[PDB]
Design a binder for this molecule. Structure first.
Ligand SMILES: OC[C@H]1O[C@H](O)[C@H](O)[C@@H](O)[C@@H]1O
Ligand SMILES: OC[C@H]1O[C@H](O)[C@H](O)[C@@H](O)[C@@H]1O
Lengths: 583, 583
């Protein structure tokens, strides 16, 4: 018995106030009835399906049902209940299930979709401001472990402005900046003033120019939002009594209850770092200052003249009351809600090194840095390591069971805006993590642009910057092309063009077709278009692709890599990734 | 490779401000390191484990780690990360995992536990008031389909009071009553007045007496709370203009915005029943009336003189704003929070025919009617049917994968207070659902008292009342012992005594030991005590129980059923359930 469904055309179609759902089956003992299990206002519904007269593909029986759209919440969850005379079988995002699927692991489509619909059309680039580019108004000194992280190399926002032509050439359409607000460090997560841009990066005037220049170049701009904790030099806290009524040293301070102090008097902070005291969101004035008020920090940078496109929320998972994460979900929801009040299409996403599904499944934020659903699966399958740099021996089966299990908790629209990257300012460079297997790096780059989600390049990844974890992953960008991997740069350029060109790489469903040992093969699917991606992490090999109605096309045009598809046989060279378009 | 862990002593121990966690392993290629993955304030933690010198059981290596308890939220989630030189393996509530488990499917223990700790010590009994017993101040007429459901047979609350000796003999310690407030129907979910008890059931005076009599007999009392919708005869709505300013027929009504009326003017209601208009929780006055105010309905019946022990929340999953379930989780949380303000140990649980995990995993309620986690697994494995009375062919493997998958989303303390029952006033009688397989009924009864959770008898189940779905599952209770299955009655009596006697049936962990085809075997585990339960749904058979360190005891004393355990061989008669205690 076989089944196919993806939460996208040609399988679904909105028509008047109805969502038409289509399921494909094939086999010797086909169920005489199929129930479409849908949900309206959390109530499970048994909607009957009827067999269509016309076979969509050779040997394929199609069933159709309908979800009434006038009632219910925007997120439409559903799955398929196959019924024989004596038994039942569920069809789900994770294949067949002998017992009912989790409600939160069904197929799901957001109709109406109130999310930030521009995110799926973007190529993102993350910039650590000090290490990217100096404006026109020493840079090669090697980063050390003692000093690296306290050393300013002097990049600024005008430097970013001046490099916009390079970033457009690369294919970038959106910037995510690390913290830019006034703060004593080079990274600036120890916020001193949420209202002013640090002069070291060019101050307010330079961020105004960057907003203008990105606007003019059609590029989005996201700022790093640090609200779990403040800096210990902030006027609110003020470790060093640079002011009169700080919270650290005055019981009568207007902000004494914006922090939690123990019975002994030690402030609660972030993972033991005393320069990052944690903000106590029990206090209703702190709530008004961060997101509740009309000119709260969250809304301030989203209205004119700043008009930023959204927020990356630092340490999103620990923000809360009383020195810990109590009432975290409510407060992240409040931040996101405040952001959308100011700008309805604001993109709000959270830093989640761990499992973000509970946050995303309650819709408290649009998206997450997809470390669990994308990054660490690739670290393990490709680089034999993981978040703790513990050894990892997982094959294609396991890698794709993992990636597909995570996605299953997410609607199609949520999947398309997940923030996928290979590394960041808080990890070792992926190129370094590969060690002797560095030839696998182009495979990751292709995967990054073809897996559902929006891709984000970590600055310098594209020209082959390497290095170990913080501080060594914050190397200065090498603008000397003699220090640049130009072949790798071109791969990023070509992939962003493939993604810009083909709707299925931005809007399409995703079906893993083959996942065994060293080879992953999946197809993106949108209307009549198909994009096939074959990844081979090991020696050269041949693989048989079973006749599949998802691949029933006029023909295949190879677009990247040296793989070859003929009569259902994929010939894959050693350590390769290939992409085909259907013609 | 083998592993054992249950979220209970002897595997965990609280000591000063530390939670000691112990893992057992056994095999030829044991990991040289084990990391205890724990979580503090949603931040994943790598806590190292150390090998204990003393083997807890033959051939078993024990690892130990610690969770610091002074920081973090009460719910302590954790799992085990086994590390070799080249690879890792996760150990979880659902056995071994090759990729990381879901955060919300780890082991979990609530320390401190602020839940209603009395629930785990209870045996519940659900009474449909009209059909249970008439007070001392016709009953055999068969229920029909035309009239049944509009016919009053005349049971009342004094009848319940008068039958308390019978219920104590049965082993009952807690009552769950169906709606008792003023309303025109026999079932009374069409609430007319939340402040008064319907005279047909004996009025306010009779519920006062029942509260006194249950108090005096050491019994808990839960009322049915109907807050998703009101009755259409309520003064707030008032379909029939029995008052001056109802919402249905007055745009200026003080409660016009407590309901949602379409552009055409049709009120939103429950699943198309016009006598149950849905309450619009966008309105801040409705919120104050139901749970926000000091004398809101939710708190009213929890303080003196009523002092009820909690609330069963009808249609908990659809309550919300705007005619649907928008902001449902916030409002259920508000109801529960209001209840605990009035009585800190109030038991609040929701009617969930579907998957309740998102509600329970956000702690918006203490528990749920465990239809998904308990009832429907038994309907399928034992009676070949399911919630829709669709055929079901699942074996022991599938049945236990299903039951253990659901539990995995729940902490140990949550599992112990899940509201388990075999049927209710909204289902066919389980005895009828068995059809020709009615000999399996005693198996379900044993299972109901030995699976983690609090058991709830549906009135009359214990003497063999049968019947089909609503209205035929609301037969009058047969007080004529000639119409009573006395053998079945005695089984309930003995099981409640086993549960009252043995801590592991109330507080213990649960490990499925064998689940193949027709046989399920599991053990409840608490400190040094063990309760072994073997269920055989088919013909008589013998089953080998592998040597297991969970079963390494002084000896086994058979307590119920005719099964026999000797030298690791279970001899199980056809269609039987057996229970042993460790001595
Ligand atoms: O938010 C974390 C930031 O501060 C931390 O202390 C790290 O050491 C630093 O590298 C990082 O930029
Ligand atoms: O809440 C549901 C109640 O009303 C429904 O209309 C049913 O028909 C009735 O049997 C039940 O008691």
């Amino acid at each position: 018995l076989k089944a196919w469904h993806l939460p996208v055309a040609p399988f679904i179609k909105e028509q008047q106030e109805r969502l038409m759902i289509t399921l494909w089956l094939s086999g010797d003992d086909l169920p005489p009835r199929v129930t479409l299990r849908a949900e309206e206002d959390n109530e499970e519904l048994s909607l009957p399906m009827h067999r269509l007269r016309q076979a969509p593909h050779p040997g394929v029986v199609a069933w159709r049902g309908e979800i009434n759209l006038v009632n219910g919440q925007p997120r439409r969850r559903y799955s398929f209940k196959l019924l024989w005379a004596d038994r039942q079988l569920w069809f789900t995002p994770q294949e067949f299930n002998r017992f009912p699927p989790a409600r939160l692991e069904q197929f799901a489509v957001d109709l109406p979709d109130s999310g930030p619909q521009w995110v799926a059309d973007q190529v993102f680039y993350q910039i650590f401001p000090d290490r990217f580019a100096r404006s026109q108004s020493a840079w090669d000194e090697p980063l050390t472990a003692e000093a690296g992280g306290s050393t300013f190399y002097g990049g600024d926002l005008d430097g970013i402005s001046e490099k916009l032509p390079y970033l457009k050439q690369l294919g970038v359409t959106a910037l995510y900046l690390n913290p830019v607000f006034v703060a004593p460090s080079v990274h600036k997560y120890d916020t001193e003033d949420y209202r002013r841009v640090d002069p070291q990066f060019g101050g307010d005037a330079a961020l105004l120019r960057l907003r203008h220049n990105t606007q003019k170049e059609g590029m989005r701009l996201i700022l790093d939002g640090v609200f779990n904790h403040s800096g210990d030099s902030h006027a609110w806290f003020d470790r060093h009594q640079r002011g009169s009524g700080g919270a650290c040293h005055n019981a009568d301070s207007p902000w004494r209850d914006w922090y939690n102090f123990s019975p002994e008097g030690v402030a609660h902070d972030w993972l033991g770092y005393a320069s990052l005291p944690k903000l106590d969101y029990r206090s209703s004035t702190l709530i008004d200052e961060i997101y509740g008020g009309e000119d709260s920090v969250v809304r301030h940078w989203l209205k004119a003249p700043w008009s930023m496109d959204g927020w990356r929320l630092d340490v999103v998972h620990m923000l809360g009351e009383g020195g810990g994460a109590r009432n975290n979900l409510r407060h992240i929801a409040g931040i996101t809600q405040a952001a959308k009040l100011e700008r309805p299409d604001a993109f709000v996403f959270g830093e989640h090194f761990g499992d973000a599904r509970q946050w995303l499944q309650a819709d408290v934020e649009d998206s997450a840095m997809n470390y669990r659903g994308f990054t660490f699966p690739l670290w393990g399958f490709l680089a034999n390591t993981d978040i703790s740099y513990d050894p990892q021996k997982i094959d294609a089966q396991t890698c794709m069971a993992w990636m597909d299990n995570y996605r299953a908790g997410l609607s199609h629209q949520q999947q398309l805006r997940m923030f996928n990257q290979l590394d960041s300012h808080d990890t070792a460079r992926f190129k370094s993590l590969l060690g002797k297997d560095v030839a696998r790096l182009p495979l990751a780059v292709v995967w990054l642009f073809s897996w559902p989600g929006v891709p984000c390049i970590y600055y310098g990844d594209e020209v082959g910057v390497d290095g170990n974890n913080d501080p060594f992953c914050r190397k200065p960008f090498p603008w000397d092309p003699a220090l640049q991997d130009g072949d790798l740069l071109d791969l990023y350029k070509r992939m962003s063009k493939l993604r810009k060109a083909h709707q299925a790489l931005r809007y399409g469903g995703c079906q893993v077709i083959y996942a065994e040992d060293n080879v992953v093969v999946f197809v993106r699917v949108y209307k009549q278009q198909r994009v096939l991606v074959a990844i081979n992490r090991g020696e050269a090999c041949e693989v048989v692709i079973e006749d599949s109605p998802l691949l029933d096309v006029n023909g295949w045009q190879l677009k990247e890599g040296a793989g070859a598809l003929h009569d259902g046989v994929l010939t894959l060279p050693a350590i390769s990734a290939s992409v085909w378009f259907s013609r």
